[PDB]
């Protein structure tokens, strides 16, 4: 599809088996959710943006399906103001800018 | 033109007549930029990124061109370590995110 930004990029996503709502981000270089409980291990890690840093649970090639389209990737999992969506999976979908 | 998202989206911006480095950023509501001495008012504002919010002094109706397009709008001014083309002048310059 073809969003426009007069508003969020706000689209519905399945992990795990539940729906959530996520921002496209092209902003982001990672996908980081609100905390949550994710299926395997994690690893401490530690992300940072305008404001500063956060530590965030990092788990692996975790399926996520994208407004209709699947991606296998990293996500990071932590005390992040919302839901974002991050290059690493924004190239899974074949997503790009134009103008 | 169109953007891949393979590396951060970093494209050339006109402030002032000066060039600068910054990415085109869906995930960002507003335009920030690297502290720079731009002349005129501002208002104080509170922006809130990944890890918390910073100071940043905005200032209104500025001439920004983006990648050749020329936009016009607020531009927030502040310690962020990457200069932030957020959706407000996006729109502007008819960005949209495909796929
Ligand atoms: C700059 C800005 C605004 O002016 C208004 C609203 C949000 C933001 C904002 O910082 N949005 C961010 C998403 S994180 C987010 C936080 C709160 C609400 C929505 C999204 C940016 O799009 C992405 N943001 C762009 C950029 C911000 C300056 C520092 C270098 C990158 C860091 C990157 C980022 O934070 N990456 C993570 C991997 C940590 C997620």
Same mark, same amino acid.
């Given at each position: &599809?073809?969003?426009?930004?007069?508003?969020? &990029? *706000? $689209? #519905? !996503?399945?992990?795990?088996?539940?729906? %959530? /709502?996520?921002?496209?981000?092209? =902003? @982001?270089?990672?996908?980081?959710? /609100?905390?949550?409980?994710? &299926?395997?291990?994690? %690893?401490? %890690?530690?992300? =940072?943006?305008?404001?500063?840093? !956060?530590? $965030?649970?990092?788990?692996?090639?975790?399926?996520? /399906? !994208?407004?209709?389209?699947? @991606?296998? +990737?990293? $996500? *990071? $999992? +932590?005390? #992040? &103001?919302?839901?974002? !969506?991050?290059?690493?999976?924004?190239?899974?979908?074949?997503?790009?800018?134009?103008?």
């Amino acid at each position: &599809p073809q969003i426009t930004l007069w508003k969020r &990029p *706000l $689209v #519905t !996503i399945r992990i795990g088996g539940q729906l %959530k /709502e996520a921002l496209l981000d092209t =902003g @982001a270089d990672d996908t980081v959710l /609100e905390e949550m409980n994710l &299926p395997g291990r994690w %690893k401490p %890690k530690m992300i =940072g943006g305008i404001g500063g840093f !956060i530590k $965030v649970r990092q788990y692996d090639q975790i399926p996520i /399906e !994208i407004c209709g389209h699947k @991606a296998i +990737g990293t $996500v *990071l $999992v +932590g005390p #992040t &103001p919302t839901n974002v !969506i991050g290059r690493n999976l924004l190239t899974q979908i074949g997503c790009t800018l134009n103008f």
